[PDB]
Every structure is written in structure tokens, then in C-alpha cells.
């Protein structure tokens, strides 16, 4: 892991949260060395992400240095495109909507840069419609520098210079997984494809495209700029990089922060700045991920670092990197049943495990928070959690049993006394 | 609830604005032609923009514009959330109750709203235009149990804002489209500075 | 004409046996020796079905509304 840091400094991938948020003149970081990066070959850029080894902070590994070089034909007869996601499907992420708030010019750099690694034609980005005031600034940034002739269709220095178009959904779901957004951009309803056709860079829109996250190509200019042997400075040999974090729940300042790999939760959450609940001597049930990482109690998790394998050394990994706690006021089974209640209103409905299997759990988790009849219902509920992992298509099928099964662990008398109390109430 | 139309307004009718027919040319020029064929997501949204809520004849209007079968229009607007079929009001307001928003005491930004206003839970107003529903997953659970509106967001909601945002909108004001109090930019608050400087020698790209 | 039942003559009218193949199919009809007539077994096409070609760039094999 190194020297357990993961510090917070100015030498990060952010320009400024407070410097200037509107269109500007690209003062320090934006468009510093423009033509010199693309003047080199793609083989200079392919494998340059291997110096970083950015796993992709969407919630899963399989690093971007591999999926862009490998699983990428040169050309057959048909063009290639870029899909840069921007929508946040996980509850309480907030890592997005702040990058576009004050850094609009940083993302436009790695669009042509990351596309040059693929040689794709154009750039299509997808934003939620509900983030409506912030998305208006994005086309203003296109009006700022792209409309100033800095990019496209020959700017600068080479024939490789292209555009960026903005689309919006309404209330969609295809943030949470790929290959539905490439279906929804056609105009179909949003019922995602099977995962191995021909996967997404073989069978796509009409022609094979690539899908990335925000910081999968937002850090791509500066990681191509500062490079190193610096992108692996924190963490072990497995993971590398400095990611944005977000703090919510019960804290003195629920806010974002910047850290890097392999920091333990006792120092990471309580710093910046306050621990307004019982920072110790409370229950402090922590959630490592957005939603797919279940509750971990007050044990050695606070000293367990934020490596991908450290939470794999715990019961559940977390790549979404969201922090919410439940110390004193929160009932354990009350909050998590509302998390299960949430999934009824965003399931697609294709897979017969997913459809009618979630609302199996919806009707029984509302029975436990009420307090109800005799046990061994827990184990039957636990077998259903052991019955939907790899039967569905999307990761929502994995995102439906992991909060449930992690509640079965670590909390045996979460309701063994509560449902007995209702059994004591009727008796 | 039910999702059908038992024939109240089969032909309302509805037409588009002559200012808005030319905007289609920007929309069709985006997609690759031949497989272009369906730009129904911004276009039917723009029909919601002109009308506010759209009838079933408004669905049938755009089907001849983009030569799709009209059944392939009913699939879209009955799936997504922001499209509306029933008649709606002028102000559409949303309580963003989510499970971490529940941890930020959404019960305060729950009722004492219906007692303040005079409406029912999850229900439009009896008079005209206030419609109140609840949504999930719009960014910041790191703020308060915040309030969404038609074109902006109201961060840092509070029972004072319950006595304000309902109150100022009944009067016709615009109650602070953003964080009304506290941190105006949602800053780390003890790390908000982070030594604001030029980013330590750009020009490392020899490599 | 008392109930409407399907009373009948034609004393055989219900005799089906289970044969193994076409080879001993003929050999049983001749061993007792009355007239017959033979159909032929129909097996369908194998056939060529492949998902993935249901999303085209210029072809016609393209599904929608799924």
C-alpha cells in the first residue's frame, strides 16, 4: 500500500472548484500542449494507460488500458464512435454533476484524445435531462472553444479533428449499465441486450463503439501529461490512482473530497472534517459502495484500507466509492428496506429472475420492518439471495442480493428480537 | 394507477410552432442517415415543452413526421418518467426522498408540507397548478433532502424552506435556485482551499 | 336413439401398436397379410439461426420494439 497515503493536495486532476466555473480563456491546465499529444502515434498512447493502470471508477475493474487497445479491431468497413457516459444511476454518488459544474473544458480534451486511441469518428455524450441547469453550461463550453475553431474539422495540426454532440434522456436507467444506452440512443425503449452477443465493441449501434465513464477520459489528458510513476504512487501493486470521494450520511460536513488508494476508513471519513454522530461509541454501520456493498459494522473495517482487494478481503468490494453511515438514529432494517423498495421503480423487466423476483423480496422486507411471525423465513429469504447472481443480465441482479445477503451476515438479532417483540405483542 | 387511454381526447388536436419546425433540421442532421429514423427522445420532449402535457393525438402527430409506426411511439412515453400523459399543473415540484436522503431527516421535508399547503400526499393541488410527487437518484444525497423544480434544483432544504418555498411560489417568487444557505458550492469545508495555485509545473509531457 | 351415445359397429376401430422402425413396419403387415399404405418420416431443417445479425448497418434483418 506504501506509506498509507492517499493525501489531499493541489497536485491532483482538478483545475479548481472555485476558480472559474463558466466559460473561460483556458488559463493554466486547459489546452496547454494541444498538438504535441496527438502528433505522436496511437502506439504512444496505447499502453500509456498501462503506466497508469486506471481500472475505471464506475464500480468495476477491467482497466481502460486493456479494453481500448485489446477488444478493438482496426477497421472492417464501418465507422467507430465514442460513448462517454455522464449519468449517475447509483443512489447518492454526486461524483458527477460537479465536474461539469466548474470544469467544462477538461472533458473536451480527452474526448478527441481518447478517441485517437480508437480512431473513432465522432463523440456522443449522454447526460440526464433532470440535471437541466448544469447541462446548459456544457453547450456553452462548446460555444466557447469548439466554436472558436480550436477543434474540428482539421484543428489542430492534423486531419483528425471532430465534433461532440449532446443528447438527453428523461428518467432512464442506462446509466447503470452499458449496451442499453447504445440501444436507447437509437430510439428503442431501453431493454438492454444480452451481454455476450458479440459484446459492446463488436455489436453496437450500427457499428462497434466504445463506452467509458467520466473520469475514464477526464483524467486521460493529465495522466498523459504528468504521467509517471505518479499514477501509481498510492495503493498496492494492484490498484493505482487518485479518485474523487463523496461523504454523506451523519457527518458534520457532508461534502466531497479528493484522496487516493489504500486509506483506512477510521482516518478517511473522520478527516474532512467532523464525525458529528458518535464517531466512536455508536453503531456506525458503514456502506463502502453506492448500493451494491452491504452494511459493515464497527469492526476492523475502519482500519481496513480502500483497496479493491481490501474490501474483497472484506465481504464485498466497492468501486462506486460512496460513504454513508448509520450510527444511532437510523434503524438498520428500516433504511435497507427502502433501498430494496427503490429497486422496484428502476428494474427493466426483461429477465424472469429479475422481474417478479425483486417484488418477492419487496413484500417480505416490508413484513420484517413491521415485525411479524415466526423465523426460518430468514433462511428462505437467504436462499432467494443465493438464487439470483448470474441468472439475469445486468448487474442489477447482482445489485439486488448483495444488500440482502450482507444483512443476513453481521446482523442475526436485527429482527430476531424485533419480530419476536411483535410475537410478544400479539401474545 | 392505470396506464391506458379510454378515449376522452382522441383528437384534441395539437400543432407545432413554426419556430419549432426548423429546429428538427438540427436534430435530424445529428444521426447517421438511414438508421437515423428515430429522434423521438428530444422531439417528443419538445412537444412536452410546447404543451406541458401531451395528448394521445400529440403522440400520433409526430409518427407521420418521422415515418415510424405509431405503436412505436406508445412504447416510449409510457416508459420514461419525465413524460406526462395526464393533464398537469404549472409548477411540478419533487421531494427527492432517497435512502441517504432519509438519513438526512427527510421526514422534516416530508409533511408539514400538506398541512402548510392544503393538499394530499403524492397529490396535485385541488386548485390549479401545484403538483407534488417524490423522486430518487438525482445526484446529491450529500446535500439536504433537497427539492427539484421545473428548471433548477433547491439545495439545502429545511423546515424554514418548507415555510418559504411553498410560500414564495404561492406569491410567484423564485426561491433561490441552488443552495439557499451554508456552502454555496458544496465545498469540502476544511479542505475547501487545498492550496489554490497553478497546478505545479505543467509541461511534464516529455515522457 | 336413447341418449345420443356414439354406439357403433366397426369392431376393430381402436388398435394402435408401437413399432420400432420402418424396417419391421412392412414385415408385420405382410406376415399377417392385409393391404396397407406407408407415409414418410419428416425431419425439419437444421437450421441456420444466429443472434447478433439482428442489428444491422445496411442489412434488412433488424428487429425493433423488443
Amino acid at each position: 500500500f506504501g506509506s498509507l497515503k492517499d493525501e489531499d493536495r493541489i497536485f491532483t486532476n482538478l483545475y479548481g472548484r472555485h476558480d472559474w466555473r463558466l466559460k473561460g480563456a483556458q488559463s493554466r491546465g486547459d489546452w496547454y500542449k494541444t498538438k504535441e499529444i496527438l502528433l505522436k502515434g496511437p502506439d504512444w498512447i496505447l499502453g500509456e494507460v498501462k503506466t497508469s493502470g486506471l481500472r475505471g471508477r464506475g464500480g468495476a475493474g477491467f482497466p481502460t488500458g486493456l479494453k481500448w487497445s485489446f477488444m478493438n479491431k482496426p477497421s472492417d468497413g464501418r465507422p467507430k464512435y465514442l460513448v462517454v457516459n455522464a449519468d449517475e444511476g447509483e443512489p447518492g454518488t454526486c461524483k458527477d454533476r460537479e465536474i461539469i459544474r466548474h470544469d467544462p473544458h477538461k472533458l473536451v480534451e480527452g474526448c478527441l484524445v481518447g478517441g485517437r486511441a480508437m480512431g473513432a469518428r465522432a463523440a456522443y455524450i449522454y447526460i440526464r435531462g433532470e440535471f437541466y441547469n448544469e447541462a446548459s453550461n456544457l453547450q456553452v463550453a462548446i460555444r466557447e472553444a469548439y466554436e472558436a475553431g480550436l477543434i474540428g474539422k482539421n484543428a489542430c495540426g492534423s486531419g483528425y479533428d471532430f465534433d461532440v454532440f449532446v443528447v438527453r434522456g428523461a428518467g432512464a436507467y442506462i446509466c447503470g449499465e452499458e449496451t442499453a444506452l447504445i440501444e436507447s440512443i437509437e430510439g428503442k425503449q431501453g431493454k438492454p441486450r444480452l451481454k455476450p452477443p458479440f459484446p459492446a465493441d463488436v455489436g453496437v449501434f450500427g457499428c462497434p463503439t466504445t463506452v467509458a465513464n467520466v473520469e475514464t477520459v477526464a483524467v486521460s489528458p493529465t495522466i498523459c501529461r504528468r504521467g509517471g510513476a505518479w499514477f501509481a504512487s498510492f495503493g498496492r501493486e494492484r490498484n493505482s490512482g487518485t479518485k474523487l470521494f463523496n461523504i454523506s450520511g451523519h457527518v458534520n460536513n457532508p461534502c466531497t473530497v479528493e484522496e487516493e488508494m489504500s486509506v483506512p476508513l477510521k482516518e478517511l471519513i473522520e478527516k474532512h472534517a467532523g464525525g458529528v454522530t458518535g464517531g466512536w461509541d455508536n453503531l456506525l454501520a458503514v456502506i463502502p459502495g453506492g448500493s451494491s456493498t452491504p452494511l459493515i459494522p464497527k469492526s476492523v473495517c475502519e482500519t481496513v484500507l480502500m483497496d479493491f482487494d481490501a474490501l474483497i478481503q472484506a465481504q464485498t468490494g466497492l468501486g462506486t466509492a460512496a460513504v454513508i453511515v448509520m450510527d444511532r438514529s437510523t434503524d438498520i432494517v428500516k433504511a435497507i428496506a427502502r433501498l430494496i423498495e427503490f429497486y422496484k421503480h428502476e428494474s427493466c423487466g426483461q429477465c424472469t429472475p429479475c422481474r417478479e423476483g425483486v417484488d418477492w423480496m419487496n413484500k417480505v422486507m416490508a413484513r420484517f420492518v413491521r415485525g411479524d411471525a415466526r423465523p426460518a423465513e430468514i433462511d428462505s429469504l437467504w436462499e432467494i439471495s443465493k438464487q439470483i447472481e448470474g441468472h439475469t443480465i445486468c448487474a442489477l441482479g447482482d445489485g439486488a442480493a448483495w444488500p440482502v445477503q450482507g444483512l443476513i451476515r453481521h446482523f442475526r438479532p436485527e429482527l430476531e428480537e424485533r419480530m419476536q417483540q411483535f410475537a410478544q405483542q400479539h401474545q | 394507477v392505470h396506464r391506458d387511454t379510454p378515449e376522452n381526447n382522441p383528437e384534441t388536436p395539437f400543432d407545432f410552432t413554426p419556430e419549432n419546425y426548423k429546429r428538427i433540421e438540427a436534430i435530424v442532421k445529428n444521426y447517421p442517415e438511414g438508421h437515423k429514423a428515430a429522434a423521438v427522445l428530444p422531439v417528443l420532449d419538445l412537444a412536452q415543452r410546447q404543451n406541458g402535457w401531451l395528448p394521445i393525438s400529440a403522440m400520433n402527430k409526430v409518427a407521420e413526421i418521422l415515418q415510424v409506426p405509431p405503436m412505436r411511439v406508445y412504447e416510449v412515453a409510457t416508459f420514461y418518467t419525465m413524460y406526462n400523459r395526464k393533464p398537469v399543473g404549472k409548477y411540478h415540484i419533487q421531494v427527492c426522498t432517497t435512502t441517504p436522503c432519509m438519513l438526512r431527516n427527510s421526514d422534516s421535508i416530508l409533511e408539514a408540507i400538506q398541512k402548510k399547503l392544503g393538499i394530499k400526499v403524492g397529490e396535485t393541488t385541488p386548485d390549479k397548478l401545484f403538483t407534488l410527487i417524490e423522486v430518487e437518484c438525482l445526484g446529491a444525497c450529500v446535500n439536504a433532502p433537497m427539492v427539484q423544480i421545473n428548471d433548477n434544483y433547491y439545495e439545502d432544504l429545511t423546515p424554514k424552506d418548507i415555510e418559504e418555498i411553498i410560500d414564495e411560489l404561492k406569491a410567484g417568487k423564485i426561491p433561490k435556485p441552488g443552495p439557499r444557505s451554508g456552502r454555496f458550492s458544496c465545498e469540502p469545508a476544511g479542505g475547501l482551499t487545498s492550496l489554490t495555485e497553478p497546478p505545479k509545473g505543467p509541461g511534464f509531457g516529455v515522457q | 336413439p336413447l341418449m345420443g351415445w356414439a354406439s357403433t359397429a366397426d369392431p376393430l376401430s381402436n388398435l394402435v401398436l408401437t413399432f420400432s422402425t420402418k424396417e419391421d413396419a412392412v414385415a408385420f403387415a405382410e406376415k399377417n397379410g392385409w393391404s396397407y399404405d406407408v407415409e414418410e418420416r419428416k425431419v425439419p431443417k437444421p437450421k441456420s439461426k444466429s443472434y447478433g445479425a439482428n442489428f444491422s448497418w445496411n442489412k434488412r434483418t433488424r428487429v425493433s420494439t423488443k
Partner: peptide, 28 residues
């Protein structure tokens, strides 16, 4: 923060310059 002025987003600059497109055919 303005509900209208999507023609500023759509028809102002993105209609003046697409560019070009060629967009392929795909007739089908």
C-alpha cells in the same frame, strides 16, 4: 436554469457547424 433556449443549444452552433457529417449509407 432557463427552460427554453435549447435552440441556443441545438440550432445556434450545432446547426451552423455539424461538421460535416458524411454519416454513411446504411440506406438500408
Amino acid at each position: 436554469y432557463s427552460t427554453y433556449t435549447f435552440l441556443d443549444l441545438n440550432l445556434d452552433l450545432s446547426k451552423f457547424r455539424m461538421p460535416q457529417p458524411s454519416s454513411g449509407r446504411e440506406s438500408p
